[PDB]
A paper describes a structure:
The presence of T119M in the heterotetramers reduces its dissociation rate and, consequently, the aggregation rate and amyloidogenesis progression. We also solved the crystal structure of the nonamyloidogenic variant T119M-TTR at 1.3 Å resolution at the same pH as a control. In our hands and in agreement with previous reports, Met at position 119 protects TTR from acid and urea-induced denaturation, by increasing the kinetic barrier of tetramer dissociation in these conditions. Noteworthy, the Gdm.HCl denaturation midpoint of T119M-TTR was lower than WT-TTR (Cm 4.3 vs. 5.1, respectively). Counterintuitively, by Gdm.HCl denaturation experiments, we found that tetramers harboring Met at position 119 were less stable than those with Thr. One plausible explanation for this behavior is that the specific residue at position 119 may differently affect tetramer stabilization mediated by Cl−, although this effect should be further confirmed. Under the assayed conditions, sedimentation velocity experiments showed WT-TTR and T119M-TTR at 5 μM behaving as a single species with an experimental sedimentation coefficient of 3.5 S (s20,w= 4.1 S) compatible with the globular tetrameric form of the protein.
TTR is an extracellular soluble nonglycosylated tetrameric protein synthesized mainly in the liver, retinal pigment epithelium, pancreas, and choroid plexus. TTR transports holoretinol-binding protein and is a minor carrier of thyroxine (T4) in the blood, whereas in the cerebrospinal fluid, it is the primary carrier of T4 (5). Extracellular misfolding and misassembly of TTR lead to the formation and accumulation of amyloid fibrils in a variety of tissues, which gives rise to distinct progressive clinical syndromes known as TTR-related amyloidosis. WT-TTR homotetramers or heterotetramers comprised of mutant and WT subunits dissociate into monomers, which can rapidly misfold and subsequently self-assemble into amyloid fibrils. It is well established that TTR tetramer dissociation is the rate-limiting step for amyloid fibril formation.
Residue numbers in the entry:
A (entry chain A), D (entry chain A): 10 to 125
B (entry chain B), C (entry chain B): 10 to 100, 103 to 125
Amino acid sequence: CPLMVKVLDAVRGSPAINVAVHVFRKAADDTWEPFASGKTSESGELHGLTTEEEFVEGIYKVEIDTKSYWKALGISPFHEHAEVVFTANDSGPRRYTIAALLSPYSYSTMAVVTNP
Amino acid sequence: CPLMVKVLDAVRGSPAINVAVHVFRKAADDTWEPFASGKTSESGELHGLTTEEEFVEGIYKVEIDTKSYWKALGISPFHEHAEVVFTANDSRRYTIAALLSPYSYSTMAVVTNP
Amino acid sequence: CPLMVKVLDAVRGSPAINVAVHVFRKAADDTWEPFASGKTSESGELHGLTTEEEFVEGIYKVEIDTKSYWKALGISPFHEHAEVVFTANDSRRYTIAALLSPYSYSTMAVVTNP
Amino acid sequence: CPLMVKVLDAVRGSPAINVAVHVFRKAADDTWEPFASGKTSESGELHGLTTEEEFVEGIYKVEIDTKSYWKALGISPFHEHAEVVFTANDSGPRRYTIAALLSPYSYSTMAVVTNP
């Protein structure tokens, strides 16, 4: 898995389930082009977004739709989403795990980058 | 001061000084319109971005230039920048804080009523 | 003010008010000796814990009573308290910040030189 | 695994490997009694600390020896360790994952609690 996203809920002490995630890649004309999307599973993880072949060098944006997540649990949160923007694969293929820990008025995000 | 931004450095345990911050407001065509900008002070804070008159309800984006901060320190970072996107609601002062590490950041909003 | 403690609430986006904070200093027999205490203010801050004369080099523990904070709000929390343990070094002011959620907390130290 | 500890390094974007972890349980006389210990693996995880039978109700303290970790990487960090203190199994057996994200002058800790 070259790109995996994991989301946790710091209010419940649980995976954040059914969180929508949209990935974009910056195009030549500097616009954000849709690249992949999905939703987190019961484990809070989203696998299978892309492949080694498709996940070329570029600048990527992972959008985690946190506001929709919170509202469905009865909470009106601060952020619209959590964005994670990074250059990927510029020194060759890597595996990326993007983690996000969510609270209504805060989030943390961490990346683990490993060489296959 | 309806909007203040504070940035901290978790590698050195210090304010993050001279960090560029850009604020955008979402326009009717869904594009991001430049709204305000500046650089953090020696206290890691950025004051005077906007005014009560000007800071109307809407969706705002605060972009914090973290990559350039780390690059100047000779540290290799993960993110291009940190982004904080939120809706301003009438019914208060917003403090957006960001705690920076090379491969992680934490952001928090403190919303208080005068 | 050589030591200040700030506590924030990530569920409500506010200062964490009236949080009990206890500071201990490690004694020669390795036990924790009560050193200072108080409750956070309406700004979530606790000032005046100690003085320059009294805050000598040594290992200190700051205990933040998070469980009681959440219980009063009717929210079920994970931790008994948050603990911040560190060595004071001569060669500055310490700000210990804690950002609280029911099953998580983040703590940060800002160490600055007058 | 009723109790697992996971540690990540926010400077390197990697698991925190070979981090010593000491677990204590509060005794009847309110002293901290040694309960289990170990070190994180190449994945940043520490498994096998205890068993369902041994991990009874109580107040537990997980000490993560962060200072020793940082010093060996050339960094003089702020904290002596990261402590995580919690009541466990007071409503029956649960599985606990304690995660810690480390920086030299900060850390985050999160617990995921699941019912078998």
